[PDB]
Design a protein around this nucleic acid. Structure first.
Lengths: 337, 68, 49, 48, 91, 48, 193, 102
RNA sequence: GUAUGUAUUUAUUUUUAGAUACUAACAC
RNA sequence: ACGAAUCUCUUUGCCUUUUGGCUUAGAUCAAGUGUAGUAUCUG
């Protein structure tokens, strides 16, 4: 098996540049649970909160455009649509609310979850929604008629994170039973199961190009090829736990947000970790409140936006000096597994 | 005999037979999508964001007032 | 000595109004079972089953 | 109170002054919450 | 009418605090007749509680005491905290 | 290892538990000592 | 381990919340630090939501628009909790910080008062020696003024029952009650909560 | 000092039963296949009725021993500690857990 | 001026005074 | 002499019938009163 270990010493992977802190935006009253970005113009954020609101921030200057209230409890997830001028928000109040970006008012309510709904993902080509939460089932909603067309029974526990893809498996899901299922919706049953995680899979992200997914757990961030459902790679992680979120830049950079406040950046190809940061908590906060609840990259991928549990949004920019003078990160030593 | 220890799996509700009662909120509405494209002297005297709810300034204003 | 005996009585019992009731009701049910059983045994001793 | 004791010493015998001054330091209780009153005046005293 | 404390009642109160915790005093005066909540809680905090310090007074305890009593004009709740002692013991 | 949790507020099963399972350092501020001293002096100055 | 430590840890949560309402610091004598980080986090969160609901409901009642019968009571409760927390905060910060006024300002003040009280040639009020001419009368006044609170009551509480009872004895023996009163003025510097 | 992970423990128990078995073999010395159908893939394995009965008896015996020893710790456990006040058995047991927590 | 709960099988399946008491939609 | 097995006891490890929710501590707090049915204590 050493042959594999030699074949890890040939590659010498993929240089990138480090990241640093451009901007800090206070202004939420509670935690910031979720963040999504205008998929077309990159002009703004929609950020959930733990105060029930949603505050639309301008990406350029960081000023606050508007506030969207309308949920009675915390907002776990928000997702904005490409083809539509719609914004689907979803919360712990058992409800998935549509939002018409034109007039800024709730249009539709989808009904039928038994309990808090922690994930929404908008299918790219079908005019569907996929919602999930402590129900332990994934509900495929018809966007127009508000009919929960398909239900996907499967995971034996709550469902943390859900994604949508145009070809087969059209829904990828991840649950606290420590599995990740790759669904075939037309037949309505699991196409493939990926069990390799040891504990709750609390975050996923789709690579914008390669047609793969990055799954997380406490200490181990793996990757997965879709289609076949193979394992692709692993990522070097000593205890970073807990990994709350993942995000994949267009340059094949894989972000990992910690609950210990550490920002662990990776190369996606290799598995190498080229940088680790630690955020500054805040003026009057607690050392417990330093963590990263969500994150995303803009459409370009040269900026990073992380909502943190200290009631602040932080915007991380990629250094322009860098190159080989002194970038080099931890520099590729594959320890024995 | 108290608290949750679990939640109810939607899987159960998936196998039941439908009733077909007609609710008020599923009546058709928004039925069409949208696609994108000298006196003074004699006197005796005289000549910032903390993150927390209780210790903020607004709060001490609040309780400083409503409690009279 | 009276209020001390009573204190000793209250401090030793945690049963509760509902819980005490379900214990005694369960006793009643088991008694009913025993009754019906021994009925059946006696009628069996006379051959009627 | 350090001041009150003295400005009451002017006007009143030190007995009553010391009394009044001490009377304001008292444990205050609402349900669970309790705290000594170390600083301000308690307006509920008859002579407040 | 207002009573002093027999060792009987006192013991029952201690066992009560052991069962019911500090905050439920009105349940303590249920066991204990002839007494009120405020009386119960009052005594437990002033006297009965074992965490209280009833002890002899060192040569430093007295120096620190006289120091405070001179420094702070009569405030025997504050001083008591400074000494971690019940007040009327300190007075 | 997580300890057992024993509360002052609730004891639902009636478990009777040791008093110590039911049941400050800092000295007084420097500024106060000075403030008290001035008044003791001020009165003395006042008395003369 | 799960279920045993589940129920236990969540109990620790509840206890930490109650201790947060009561302003009690909530240390557990031993407990793995990271768990304490977590529980401190969530209880800070719940605290912030709770407070913000208190503000919001209050400023909804000031306008006086469709507040439920209980929400008024509950909101009052949350406000009294918050107010006492502000009080204890102020007092602690005075201990750590020390008194605000400064020795200078204090000296100026005391000087002012002295200058006045000489300007008016004022006599310090004596202590009320027994055989005071008006003692029994001032007694009668004070006792009446306490009595009146009770008098306009249809039904009386036991504590109230005690309050009315104590005064009545009071009428019978003023001279003794004066002895006790002035004895308290001298001896007792520590009082009930 | 110390705890033991569920693996090492598993190994140890495996070894323990190996020793016990080897002793059954030695004392037994002192006192003195695979066919799969073509029709179905069902495999069949020739067995000695002895050693199977010996197995069942071993399992039952060890269960009895464990149950008994734990039972004796039941008995002593409650009779040892009479110090603090207790309303019921379950209280006493809980407070002995508090003695373990020290 | 008690919800609520349990049971209601008839017609025949092959071989000497009273003290301490508990309680009471019964009398402010 | 040590290897091996059974029984008994002590120590360590494992926890065995070993506190299952939220709200304004969820709110409140006594001699309480007359008579009456029935239990039983003593000469």
């Amino acid at each position: 098996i050493v042959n594999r270990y030699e074949k890890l010493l040939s590659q010498r992977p993929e240089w990138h540049a480090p990241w640093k802190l451009s901007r800090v935006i206070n202004g939420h009253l509670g935690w910031v649970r979720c963040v999504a970005i205008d998929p077309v113009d990159n002009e703004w954020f929609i950020t959930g909160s733990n105060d029930t609101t949603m505050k639309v921030w301008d990406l350029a200057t960081g000023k606050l455009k508007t506030t969207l209230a309308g949920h009675v409890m915390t907002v776990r997830d928000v997702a904005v649509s490409d083809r539509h001028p719609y914004l689907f928000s979803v919360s712990e109040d058992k409800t998935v609310k549509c939002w018409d970006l034109e007039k800024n008012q709730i249009i539709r309510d989808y009904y039928g979850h038994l309990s808090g709904v922690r994930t929404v993902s908008i299918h790219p080509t079908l005019d569907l929604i996929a919602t999930a939460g402590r129900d332990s089932v994934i509900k495929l909603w018809d966007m127009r008629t508000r009919i929960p067309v398909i239900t996907l029974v499967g995971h034996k526990g709550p469902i943390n994170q859900v994604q949508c893809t145009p070809v087969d498996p059209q829904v990828v899901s991840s649950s606290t039973d420590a599995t990740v299922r790759l669904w075939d919706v037309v037949a309505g049953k699991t196409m493939k199961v990926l069990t390799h995680h040891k504990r709750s899979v609390r975050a996923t992200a789709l690579h914008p190009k390669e047609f793969s997914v990055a799954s997380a757990c406490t200490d181990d961030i793996r990757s997965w090829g879709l289609a076949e459902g193979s394992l692709l790679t692993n990522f070097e992680s000593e205890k970073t736990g807990i990994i709350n979120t993942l995000s994949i830049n267009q340059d094949d950079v894989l972000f990992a947000g910690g609950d210990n406040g550490v920002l662990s950046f990776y190369d996606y190809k290799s598995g190498h970790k080229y940088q680790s940061l630690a955020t500054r908590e805040m003026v009057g906060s607690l050392e417990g409140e330093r963590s990263v609840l969500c994150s995303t990259f803009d459409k370009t991928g040269l900026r990073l936006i992380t909502g943190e549990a200290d009631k602040s949004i932080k915007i991380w920019k990629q250094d322009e000096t860098a190159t080989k003078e002194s970038e080099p990160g931890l520099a590729w030593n594959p320890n024995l597994s | 005999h108290r608290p949750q220890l679990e939640a109810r799996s939607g899987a159960k509700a998936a196998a039941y037979t439908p009733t077909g009662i007609e609710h008020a909120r599923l009546l058709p509405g928004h039925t069409t999508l949208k696609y994108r494209k000298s006196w003074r002297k004699g006197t005796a005297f005289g000549r910032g964001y903390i993150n927390d709810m209780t210790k903020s300034e607004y709060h001490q204003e609040f309780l400083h007032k409503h409690v009279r | 000595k009276e209020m001390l005996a009573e204190a000793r009585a209250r401090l030793l019992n945690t049963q509760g109004k509902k819980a005490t009731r379900k214990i005694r009701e369960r006793m009643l049910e088991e008694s009913k079972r025993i009754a019906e059983l021994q009925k059946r045994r006696e009628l069996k001793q006379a051959g009627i089953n | 109170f350090t001041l009150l004791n003295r400005l009451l010493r002017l006007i009143v015998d030190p007995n009553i002054a010391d009394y009044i001054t001490a009377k304001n330091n008292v444990v205050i209780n609402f349900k669970d919450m309790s705290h000594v009153n170390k600083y301000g005046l308690i307006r509920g005293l008859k002579f407040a | 009418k207002g009573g002093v404390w027999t060792n009987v009642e006192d013991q029952i109160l201690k066992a009560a605090v052991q069962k019911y915790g500090t905050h439920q005093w009105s349940k303590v005066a249920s066991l204990l007749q002839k007494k009120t909540a405020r009386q119960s809680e009052l005594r437990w905090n002033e006297y009965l509680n074992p965490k209280l310090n009833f002890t002899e007074f060192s040569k430093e305890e007295d120096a620190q005491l006289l120091d405070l009593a001179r420094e702070l004009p009569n405030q025997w709740r504050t001083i008591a905290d400074m000494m971690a002692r019940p007040a009327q013991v300190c007075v | 290892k997580i300890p057992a949790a024993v509360s002052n507020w609730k004891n639902p099963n009636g478990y009777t538990v040791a008093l110590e399972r039911r049941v400050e350092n800092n000295t007084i501020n420097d500024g106060f000592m000075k403030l008290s001293e001035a008044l003791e002096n001020a009165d003395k100055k006042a008395r003369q | 381990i799960r279920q045993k430590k589940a129920r236990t840890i969540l109990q620790h949560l509840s206890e930490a919340w109650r201790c947060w309402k009561a302003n009690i610091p909530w240390d557990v004598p031993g407990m793995p630090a990271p768990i304490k980080k977590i529980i401190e986090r969530y209880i800070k969160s719940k605290a912030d939501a709770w407070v913000s609901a208190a503000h919001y409901n209050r400023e909804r009642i000031k306008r006086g628009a469709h507040v439920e019968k209980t929400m008024v009571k509950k909101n009052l409760g949350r406000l009294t909790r918050l107010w006492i927390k502000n009080e204890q905060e102020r007092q602690r910060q005075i201990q750590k910080n020390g008194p605000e006024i400064t020795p200078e300002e204090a000296t100026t003040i005391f000087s002012v008062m002295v200058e006045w009280l000489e300007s008016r040639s004022f006599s310090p009020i004596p202590f009320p020696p027994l055989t005071y001419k008006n003692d029994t009368k001032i007694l009668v006044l004070a006792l009446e003024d306490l009595k009146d609170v009770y008098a306009s009551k249809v039904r009386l509480n036991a504590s109230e029952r005690e309050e009315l009872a104590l005064i009545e004895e009071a009428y019978d023996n003023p001279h003794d009650t004066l002895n006790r009163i002035k004895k308290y003025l001298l001896t007792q510097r520590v009082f009930k909560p | 000092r110390g705890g033991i992970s569920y693996d090492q423990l598993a190994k140890l128990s495996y070894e323990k039963t190996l020793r016990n078995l080897a002793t059954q073999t030695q004392n037994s010395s002192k006192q003195d296949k695979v066919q799969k159908d073509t029709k179905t893939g069902k495999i069949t394995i020739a067995d000695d009725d002895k050693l199977v009965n010996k197995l069942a008896v071993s399992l039952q015996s060890e269960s009895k021993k464990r149950y008994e020893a734990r039972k004796r710790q039941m008995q002593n456990a409650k009779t040892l500690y009479g110090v603090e006040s207790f309303i019921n058995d379950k209280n006493k047991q809980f407070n002995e857990k508090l003695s373990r927590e020290s």
